[PDB]
Design a protein around this ligand. Structure first.
Ligand SMILES: Nc1nc2c(ncn2[C@@H]2O[C@H](COP(=O)(O)OP(=O)(O)OP(=O)(O)O)[C@@H](O)[C@H]2O)c(=O)[nH]1
Length: 377
């Protein structure tokens, strides 16, 4: 059997996520702002959770229909054969509802009506006279309404995917965003890579895991691993496969610096937890003094944004100082993410590309500065 899955992502991450899904061998059905819909074989749920670095989670799509009234929402939800997806005794909390530009804007009421519909559907299938028991494993139901089109799905993930298990940290960049940053560059294992304001090390940890082909989900668990409705052998084979795919022969080193000594301590701890401590060296250091004799290196970094009035002036000077230091490097490429709108002006250089991205509550841009190209003829 095949599945239709949906993976939400931050706006601006759709291209990277689509590329990852394509690399897993799956067909993309629909690309929309903040979510990719795709078709997979029976390995799809396990493989998607195991391997996708830019997905915030992996949903199993159950149904899509129009609903302009609560009666219509109820009737359409109830007619779904829920017993096919929710087994006897299973828990089915309606974990979340989102409604955008739709008549059914009250999400808690959407949740209650969907709950009632599913209870009615199951009661009919399971001929349940007494209490419909909900004491076994959990199938969290998600409802998404956009311009009156309702999508109902089941969460296969549980804890948000960005939680790989290594984050034990100030204000770290999201793991999924960090992986997307790496993917937006030409960096490959073996090439010099430095994050000179590395904080708790997220960007470098994500890059190291990409470099040794360590699956993001390798050291965490997923709610669907407990589902009686799945063949447990599939999840098992997918995990074993992922372990075997780790590149154990490759040797490389990438580097992080920060002036916050506690952040370096945390970064080292986090890399050990992630299992990539052998590929990263973290040190206290000042990015404005960064120098190298190597050429053709990469910098990928997340500097302070200077959002507070009290910080704005020092951050502007930092940007100028970074520009000076980075331009003295020999044919390096550098990439910086910041919400500071006028970054290019203070940095002293126009980017090749500027991509709009999101740490959710923050509207950030990724400024890309690939090194000079060879001469023309
Ligand atoms: N090396 C260096 N670090 C600096 C300098 N100025 C500020 N920083 C650090 O640069 C980091 C960039 O800001 P953050 O937003 O905190 O980076 P981060 O939150 O650690 O991002 P993550 O990698 O996900 O943890 C901060 O941890 C600051 O301590 C500097 O002049 N040199």
């Amino acid at each position: 059997k095949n599945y239709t899955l949906i993976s939400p992502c931050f706006f601006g991450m759709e291209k990277m996520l689509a590329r990852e899904i394509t690399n897993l061998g799956y067909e993309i059905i629909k690309t929309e702002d903040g979510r990719i819909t795709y078709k997979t074989d029976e390995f799809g749920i396990a493989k998607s959770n195991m391997w996708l670095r830019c997905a915030e989670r992996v949903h199993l799509k159950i149904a899509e229909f129009e609903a302009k009234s609560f009666d219509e929402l109820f009737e359409n939800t109830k007619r779904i054969n829920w017993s096919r997806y929710i087994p006897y005794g299973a828990q089915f909390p309606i974990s979340k509802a989102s409604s955008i530009k739709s008549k059914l804007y009250s999400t808690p009421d959407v949740q209650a009506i969907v709950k009632k519909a599913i209870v009615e559907s199951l009661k009919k299938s399971y001929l349940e006279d007494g209490l419909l028991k909900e004491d076994k494993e959990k199938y969290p139901i998600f409802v998404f309404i956009h311009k009156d089109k309702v999508t109902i799905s089941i969460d296969t993930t549980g804890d948000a995917l960005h939680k790989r298990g290594y984050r034990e940290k100030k204000a770290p960049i999201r793991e999924t965003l960090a992986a997307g940053l790496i993917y937006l560059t030409p960096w490959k294992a073996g090439r010099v890579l430095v994050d000179p304001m590395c904080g708790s090390g997220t960007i470098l940890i994500e890059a190291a895991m990409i470099g040794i082909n360590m699956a993001p989900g390798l050291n965490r668990e997923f709610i669907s691993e407990k589902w009686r409705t799945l063949d447990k052998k599939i999840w098992w084979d997918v995990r074993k496969d992922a372990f075997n795919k780790i590149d154990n022969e490759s040797k490389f080193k990438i580097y992080g610096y920060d002036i916050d000594e506690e952040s370096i301590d945390i970064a080292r701890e986090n890399a050990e937890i992630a299992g990539v401590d052998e590929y990263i060296e973290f040190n206290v250091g000042d990015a404005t003094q960064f120098k190298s004799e190597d050429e053709f290196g990469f910098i990928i970094t997340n500097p302070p944004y200077g959002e507070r009035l009290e910080d704005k002036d020092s951050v502007k000077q930092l940007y100028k100082e970074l520009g000076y230091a980075f331009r003295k490097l020999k044919n390096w490429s550098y990439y910086l993410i910041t919400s500071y709108e006028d970054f290019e002006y203070e940095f002293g250089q126009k980017a090749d590309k500027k991509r709009k991205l999101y740490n959710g509550m923050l509207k950030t841009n990724f400024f890309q500065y690939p090194g000079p190209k060879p001469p023309r003829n």
